[PDB]
Design a protein around this ligand. Structure first.
Ligand SMILES: O=c1[nH]c(=O)n([C@H]2C[C@H](O)[C@@H](COP(=O)(O)O)O2)cc1F
Ligand SMILES: O=c1[nH]c(=O)n([C@H]2C[C@H](O)[C@@H](COP(=O)(O)O)O2)cc1F
Lengths: 281, 281
């Protein structure tokens, strides 16, 4: 079967041949296409792009970070992952109108939405136990008791909380599917930076399927990446052109060195990526 | 210029060929595929499927019903459309534990989420002016003020309001896109019956896009249909195969007779479908 990465390179290709010019908040300018969908098999392999090294440590840590229900950039920073510190800075907070908010506090972002959807938000350092709808755990429960369910969904898009956020969620929602004891997941992404972003997202949710599959006794199935506004910044054009020529190398494999019973007991040491030979950067 | 209805007929074909068996809530078997996508042009044509007649009056009347933020089945029923009456019956309610609810009261469904997302749902008679977030309106405002924005989303999936609904929503969320004065919409359906549902849904949101484009002064672009669980009942595999051999007829045209400026000011008399000649069956 053709390499799984071709699906992704094929999209960069499309955006370059049919992508119309569009601007972002700043006005940097990009080439955009609206409405894309890619399929990545998770059966005995892991969709960790090879044409360009992906920040694996970042993916793993950020996911464990969401799982906890944390909305503090600091807790993720103190792990070597700074991808969220920029939004937790002292100025950025006031820039949007959050002066009373302590530095680091991102607001009711991802994590919060997954474990306490609909709960009155207050501050990053607070207890929310038994508050709001715990979607993540509900999903696990359903997959275990009624795998045929067609309404197994995790929604991070909360219209009423959007204001109180450092940045709207790029991942509006994800849906799970089970058939022949095989767990699949589809992610809806409102906007994606094909250049240096989508690759990290593909792995984030690919990992999330793996974890859930592990605690539900199912086998990883398919990961469907659905995009809204898929764009490439005008400057990443050249860099990607030489990347489209690089031949994709066999995807690595993710092994779970331990046996976990609950989604919360997952440790960063519990995982291991073998056969990951990315292209030089 | 490949006919639009082929994208759709293609999907059914794909399900028959690659789909697997999967039982629904009642135990009935379906041929299921998880993860699908089609693109429909809204330029000078309306994607009202021709290989089989679609209940247009139902499509138009129902949408006008959502714009009103109504949640009373009887309001829609007293218009000639009975697609929701079943969930409003005294009997249906009781079994769900809504013995206090009145006949017709569906709960915090589409209308409600669209105009009062987050608001505390009382009953189908209550007034919610100013309560919750009016997503429909917010979408429309944003198209005008910040067309390049990538947050133009309208979510109908409210984890918190689930237990109060007659049934979970099928249209999780929809995203809009604006480029080169063209208005596009993507819809994410968690699940859809390719035979009865999907055709109806396609039309419904194509209509919505026409409306919002009309009000914002933009030209309808594309309508992207994203699916989660695309299924077909096993007992329909035969009549479907027969329909799959039907040659799609030219898509009809949609015309808004009078100029409207506000989304609430739309009335059924303002629309007209011309050139709709579906396959008799
Ligand atoms: O996982 C990520 N996904 C992503 O899309 N962005 C950025 C890339 C893009 O430049 C920005 C767009 O934000 P918006 O759609 O609000 O304009 O989102 C960053 C991440 F870490
Ligand atoms: O507009 C509609 N779209 C739609 O897909 N369904 C039905 C078709 C499918 O048989 C059912 C599945 O519901 P569930 O996923 O809860 O089993 O949704 C009903 C509508 F009114």
């Amino acid at each position: 079967p053709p390499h799984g990465e071709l699906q992704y390179l094929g999209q960069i290709q499309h955006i370059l041949r049919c992508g119309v010019r569009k601007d972002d908040r700043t006005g940097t300018g990009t080439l955009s296409v609206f409405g894309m969908q890619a399929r990545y098999s998770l059966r005995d392999e892991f969709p960790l792009l090879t044409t360009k090294r992906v920040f694996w440590k970042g993916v793993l840590e950020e996911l464990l970070w969401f799982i906890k229900g944390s909305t503090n950039a600091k807790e993720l920073s103190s792990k070597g992952v700074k991808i969220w510190d920029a939004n937790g800075s002292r100025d950025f907070l006031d820039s949007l109108g959050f002066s009373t908010r302590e530095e680091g506090d991102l607001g009711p972002v991802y994590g919060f939405q997954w474990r306490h959807f609909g709960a009155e938000y207050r501050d990053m350092e607070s207890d929310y136990s038994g508050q709001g709808v715990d979607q993540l755990q509900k999903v696990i429960d359903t997959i275990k008791t009624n795998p045929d369910d067609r309404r197994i969904i995790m929604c991070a898009w909360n219209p009423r909380d959007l204001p109180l956020m450092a940045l709207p969620p790029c991942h509006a929602l994800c849906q799970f599917y089970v058939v022949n004891s095989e767990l699949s997941c589809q992610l809806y992404q409102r906007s994606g930076d094909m250049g240096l972003g989508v690759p990290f997202n593909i792995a984030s949710y690919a990992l999330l399927t793996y974890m859930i599959a592990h605690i539900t006794g199912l086998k990883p199935g398919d990961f469907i990446h659905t995009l809204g506004d898929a764009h490439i910044y005008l400057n990443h054009i050249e860099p990607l052109k030489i990347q489209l020529q690089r031949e994709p190398r066999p995807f690595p494999k993710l092994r779970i060195l331990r046996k976990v019973e609950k989604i919360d007991d997952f440790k960063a040491e519990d995982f291991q990526i073998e056969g990951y030979n990315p292209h030089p950067t």
